[PDB]
Paper text:
pmcMHC class I molecules bind peptide antigens and present them to cytotoxic T lymphocytes (CTLs). We herein demonstrate that human leukocyte antigen (HLA)-A∗24:02 and HLA-C∗14:02 proteins, which are known to bind conventional long peptides, also have the potential to bind N-myristoylated short lipopeptides. Thus, we concluded that the structural flexibility of the large B pocket of HLA-A∗2402 and HLA-C∗1402 primarily accounted for their previously unrecognized capacity to bind such chemically distinct ligands as conventional peptides and N-myristoylated lipopeptides.
The synthetic lipopeptide, N-myristoylated Gly-Ala-Asn-Phe (Myr-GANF; note that the C-terminal 3 amino acid residues were identical to the peptide used above), was also able to promote HLA-A∗24:02 complex formation, as evidenced by the increased signal at an elution volume of 15 ml (indicated with an arrow), which raised the possibility that the Myr-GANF lipopeptide may function as a potent ligand for HLA-A∗24:02. To establish the molecular basis underlying the potential of HLA-A∗24:02 to bind lipopeptides and determine how the amino acid residue at position 9 may impact ligand binding, the soluble form of HLA-A∗24:02 complexed with the Myr-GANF lipopeptide was prepared, and its crystal structure was determined. In both cases, Ser9 was located at the bottom of the B pocket, and the hydroxyl group of its side chain was positioned away from the ligand by establishing hydrogen-bond interactions with neighboring amino acid residues (His70 and Asp74 for HLA-A∗24:02 and Thr97 for Mamu-B∗098), which enabled the Cβ atom of Ser9 to interact with the myristoyl group via VDW forces. Therefore, the spatial orientation of the side chain of Ser9 contributed not only to the space expansion of the B pocket cavity but also to the creation of the hydrophobic surface suitable for accommodating the acyl chain of lipopeptide ligands. In the lipopeptide-bound complex, the A pocket was ligand-free, but the hydrogen-bond network was still maintained by the use of intervening water molecules.
Author numbering:
A (entry chain C): 2 to 5
B (entry chain B): 0 to 99
C (entry chain A): 0 to 276
């Protein structure tokens, strides 16, 4: 779900 | 990029009895990256109806796969697993030893 | 069993010049796989891989399929971000792996949670054991850690891992109870293989056990032979059980100095085997  | 070379085990599901149908397994593990080619061989020749498990990986992030096929071992037929991977200069062939 | 785990795993592999990255995800309860998704497959759905998961309603398959597809898009984006962080070219193929899950005790209570990433086979960022902060492995991962800290990703993950993840694991253990709760002990035996007139191999076998966790060790005169045992990786039989063997090379006539020791949750008592022709 979270981007780098 | 860490590269890890595959470990290979070739073995039957059940203790081999000449004449009785069984399953021939080739378990490939510990490799990275994930692209790999695996063939089961009967007397040097690629076996056709070979299935394999879904790509998974271990705690150290290295991949593992099980390839398998039904087979009926005999006294003289040789079986092997042939594996190619980027870490190998040449395809590695591992012969089935019914005691391992 | 005394404790249980649910684990989800995903792998994305970029394919420069050959379209979007290959994405493969699998879910496990203990050592039993129960779902998969493969971006190469025609259905574009999450698919069952154990019979008991088919007890889940159609809403489950729709919702999980949407989430796994959204995750494949996130990891497509993250592979692009990684190229920039590491100043790598668009010509090479790279790998992004993720794992998350939870452990619960046999009393049904949360034990531990996990949420981690690896890039090209090396740790990138991982949720720490207290589920409150991140271990970031290198300079690029600190950029991610900063962003995740400001967005409170750890609190979102902690709430999923202690809540929905535990609830799902407990439901699966109920629906798959007959198979998931078994602790089938190994069937054991020993073989003997002369190598020469000076040496022979004793091999200790464990067959047909579940779950996969097991300890096989050789002793000589009551002392661990860890420095001399050939020990193969625990391997699947293909029928839901596992196999393992351990071997030692033994000077001729000294077989009775050696004992094989087997520990497995399915055993009432640890086993001790001797060569007894
Ligand atoms: Zn249990
Ligand atoms: Zn001699």
């Amino acid at each position: 779900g979270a981007n780098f | 990029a860490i590269q890890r070379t595959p470990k290979i085990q070739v073995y039957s599901r059940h203790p081999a009895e000449n004449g009785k149908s069984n399953f021939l397994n080739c378990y490939v593990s510990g490799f990275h990256p994930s692209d790999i080619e695996v063939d089961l061989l009967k007397n040097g020749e690629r076996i056709e109806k070979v299935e394999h498990s879904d790509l998974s990986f271990s705690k150290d992030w290295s991949f593992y796969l099980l390839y398998y096929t039904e087979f009926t071992p005999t006294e003289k037929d040789e079986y092997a697993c042939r594996v190619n991977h980027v870490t190998l200069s040449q395809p590695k062939i591992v012969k089935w030893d019914r005691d391992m | 069993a005394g404790s249980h785990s649910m684990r989800y795993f995903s792998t994305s592999v970029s394919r420069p010049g050959r379209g979007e990255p290959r994405f493969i995800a699998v879910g496990y309860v203990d050592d039993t796989q129960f779902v998969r998704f493969d971006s190469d497959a025609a259905s574009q759905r999450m698919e069952p891989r154990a019979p008991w998961i088919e007890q889940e309603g159609p809403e489950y398959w729709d919702e999980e399929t949407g989430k796994v597809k959204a995750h494949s898009q996130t990891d497509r984006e993250n592979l692009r971000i990684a190229l920039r962080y590491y100043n790598q070219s668009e010509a090479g193929s790279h790998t992004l792996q993720m794992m998350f899950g939870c452990d619960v005790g046999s009393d049904g209570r949360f034990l531990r949670g996990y949420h981690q990433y690896a890039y090209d086979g090396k740790d990138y960022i991982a949720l720490k054991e207290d589920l409150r902060s991140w271990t970031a492995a290198d300079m690029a991962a600190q950029i991610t850690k900063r962003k995740w800290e400001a967005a409170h990703v750890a609190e979102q993950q902690r709430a999923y891992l202690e809540g929905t993840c535990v609830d799902g694991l407990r439901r699966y253990l109920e629906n798959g109870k007959e198979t998931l709760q078994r602790t089938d002990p190994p069937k054991t035996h020993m073989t003997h293989h002369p190598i020469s007139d000076h040496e022979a191999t004793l091999r200790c076998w464990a067959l047909g056990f579940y779950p996969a966790e097991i300890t096989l060790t050789w002793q000589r005169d009551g002392e661990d032979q860890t420095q001399d045992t050939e020990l193969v990786e625990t391997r699947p039989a293909g029928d839901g059980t596992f196999q393992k063997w351990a071997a030692v090379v033994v000077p001729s006539g000294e077989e009775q100095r050696y004992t094989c020791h087997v520990q497995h949750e399915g055993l009432p008592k640890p086993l001790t085997l001797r060569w007894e022709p």
